[PDB]
Symmetry: C6
Subunit: 71 residues, 6 copies
Amino acid sequence: TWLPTLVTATPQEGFDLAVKLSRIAVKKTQPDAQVRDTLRAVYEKDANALIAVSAVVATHFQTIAAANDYW
Amino acid sequence: TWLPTLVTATPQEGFDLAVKLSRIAVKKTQPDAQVRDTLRAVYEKDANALIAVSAVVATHFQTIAAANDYW
Amino acid sequence: TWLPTLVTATPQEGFDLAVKLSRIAVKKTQPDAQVRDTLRAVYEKDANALIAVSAVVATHFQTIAAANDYW
Amino acid sequence: TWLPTLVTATPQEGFDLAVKLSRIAVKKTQPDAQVRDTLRAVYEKDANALIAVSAVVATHFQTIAAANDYW
Amino acid sequence: TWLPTLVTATPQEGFDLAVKLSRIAVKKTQPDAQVRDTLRAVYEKDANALIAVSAVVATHFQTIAAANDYW
Amino acid sequence: TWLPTLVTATPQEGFDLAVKLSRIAVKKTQPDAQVRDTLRAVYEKDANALIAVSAVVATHFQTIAAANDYW
Ligand code: HEM
Ligand code: HEM
Ligand code: HEM
Ligand code: HEM
Ligand code: HEM
Ligand code: HEM
């Protein structure tokens, strides 16, 4: 039971839930934590990757903001 | 009959379905399970590929979440 | 008369309609079926392309799910 | 006056308008019809370009479809 | 006071507002007009860039169409 | 407490918040402000990077605009 609800007390908590939702898709499709570390070293310093990341969390934040009727 | 409903009990199973839906699209377009195996070996270790992947499911989760009235 | 309605009997039929809607954009912008075959040989085996494909059908499935009030 | 309304009789004409809308954006940004011809020759034979293209129209179709109350 | 409202008299005016909204994000993140000119010379003739542009304005047009209850 | 509310007085401040939200995502993922400086130097002069950037904020603006009932 990792995703109980989308209901979030503050908009802030929603954005962290949004970052969370983004990473869990990743952890599911690549559960090998050893390779998840090796790729981190790569994208953490890649501009386009980091923009692309914000893109994902943007989509999710849209879903959870609506879940909270925009707090 | 693989996609009976968008209704899901919890957000967790909303996210799992979102993931499945993401996958069935590639399965329909590229049915040769063998080549699917070849490319798995390429994207599972790609950073940009994994973030892209997270995005697709983020769009899908957005649909089902709405379909469940956000739990 | 290729696109009569977005109304779909089952969620499943909506996803196939979504895959359809994705390909018709392609067929319109590149009606030369000869080059559509040559490009198929290329993207059918490209991981990023295949993710990108799921992305498109994801957007469309969002539109048709809503059209069916999520079945 | 090129974009009078988003109202469209059928979904088919919804998709055609979606396509047009996609195109008018590139036409506005790059008005030199000649170079537009040069690049046409490059993307019409690009796979990733065609899928990208399908995506833009998928976003647009999403807007008008909503504007037509989904027919 | 550059962005007073999203309310637009005609759908057409909404698309121009959408193109506007797209460029202002750019002007904010890169206010040096000298480098904005140098990059223009580059993307104005890049197919994928020009598709990518239409993608942005597509998202925005979705937001402003809704703002106008689709005119 | 950095994200107190999505409510914004004007669309202008809607767009500014949208931009901020876009940035906080990269700040959370990559907190080492120093490397953030290094990559700034790379994307601020990239065309595809700037359009990508505009897209993220276009998604975000879509969320808050909805949260403000479009002003
Ligand atoms: C917009 C995203 C796209 C989606 C969702 C999509 C989906 C599909 C699907 C589901 C099939 C059937 C595969 C099978 O059952 O064997 C297919 C086949 C095919 N697609 Fe795509 N496609 C997309 C883009 C493209 C593009 C850009 C091209 C090239 C211009 C293309 C060319 C083809 C061709 C030629 C086939 C028939 C392949 C064969 O002979 O087996 N498609 N596509
Ligand atoms: C829409 C984006 C995609 C998502 C969300 C996704 C998700 C997943 C997940 C959750 C798994 C299970 C991983 C595990 O339990 O270790 C998986 C495995 C797999 N995927 Fe993807 N995938 C995507 C795209 C693709 C593509 C483009 C391909 C290649 C054609 C592909 C081929 C495979 C294969 C063959 C496996 C089984 C791998 C193994 O043997 O461990 N997937 N995927
Ligand atoms: C966000 C997506 C963008 C859109 C929708 C967009 C749209 C437009 C449009 C419609 C024009 C007017 C073209 C004309 O009438 O001649 C234009 C011009 C221009 N754009 Fe973009 N643009 C985008 C991104 C960018 C970026 C990333 C840059 C570089 C930082 C840029 C720099 C310029 C410049 C310098 C001009 C004036 C070009 C000239 O001197 O004719 N734009 N853009
Ligand atoms: C937003 C994504 C786009 C869509 C949906 C789109 C769609 C289309 C369609 C449906 C056609 C008619 C094809 C035919 O009847 O054979 C076409 C042709 C054309 N497009 Fe695109 N296009 C897009 C982007 C672009 C871009 C970026 C350029 C280059 C600046 C471009 C330049 C052209 C030109 C010059 C033609 C006429 C080609 C010919 O002479 O056959 N389009 N496009
Ligand atoms: C889906 C988009 C993603 C988002 C929003 C995201 C976000 C984050 C955030 C906020 C952190 C914490 C950073 C810190 O506080 O130091 C983090 C760390 C990390 N991420 Fe990502 N991430 C994404 C994709 C990925 C991918 C694709 C991978 C590789 C498979 C990955 C691997 C890691 C690892 C290993 C860490 C821990 C790094 C460390 O040891 O400091 N993430 N991520
Ligand atoms: C989500 C997309 C992004 C948006 C909307 C965005 C927006 C902005 C804006 C509006 C500024 C102020 C520019 C000025 O006043 O001259 C800025 C500056 C800056 N950005 Fe971004 N940014 C994005 C992504 C990133 C990324 C990926 C990085 C690198 C990790 C980054 C690092 C920086 C840094 C270090 C500055 C300060 C630059 C300076 O000293 O002038 N941003 N950004």
